[PDB]
Write a protein that binds this ligand. Structure first.
Ligand SMILES: [Co+2]
Ligand SMILES: [Co+2]
Ligand SMILES: [Co+2]
Lengths: 132, 13
């Protein structure tokens, strides 16, 4: 189907300062932090927008920290409990009246193995849209 | 990519 207009080409989510003592146990995680994507002027005939996610994964399957903190990975979810690791997809309905679409997402830091160490958190998740 | 999400943060001792 014909494409919408991407409103949010870039989005940032800042997990802020996390303390290593709170990321000690295996499976420990930060609070969720919201991030959202928006599309506009979805043409007539286009009623669903599919986002395909990608980014470098580490051995845990979650997104790899490109920063220096060790034993940290990044998790992306939608607003319904679905994990969106690399290669995942999520589809939303275009709002019929406004001809817009949006993706309410959330990110957290996770230590799968435990024992997070001090350092930066840095990652980039890429999204390609398809239309139906 | 059509969109990119940048994730930022810091783990502090
Ligand atoms: Co925060
Ligand atoms: Co900051
Ligand atoms: Co909403």
């Amino acid at each position: 189907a014909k494409p919408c207009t991407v409103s949010t080409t870039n989005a940032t989510v800042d997990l802020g300062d996390l303390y290593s003592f709170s990321l000690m146990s295996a499976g420990a995680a930060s609070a969720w932090h919201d991030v959202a994507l928006e599309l506009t002027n979805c043409p007539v005939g286009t009623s669903r927008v599919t986002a395909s996610f990608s980014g470098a994964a580490d051995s845990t399957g979650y997104y790899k920290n490109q920063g220096t903190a060790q034993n940290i990975q990044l998790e992306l979810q939608d607003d319904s409990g679905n994990t969106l690791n690399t290669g995942a997809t999520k589809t939303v309905q275009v709002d019929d009246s406004s001809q817009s679409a949006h993706f309410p997402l959330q990110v957290r830091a996770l230590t799968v193995n435990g024992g997070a160490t001090q350092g930066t958190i840095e990652a980039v998740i890429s999204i390609t849209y398809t239309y139906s | 990519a059509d969109s990119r999400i940048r994730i930022r943060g810091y783990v502090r001792n």
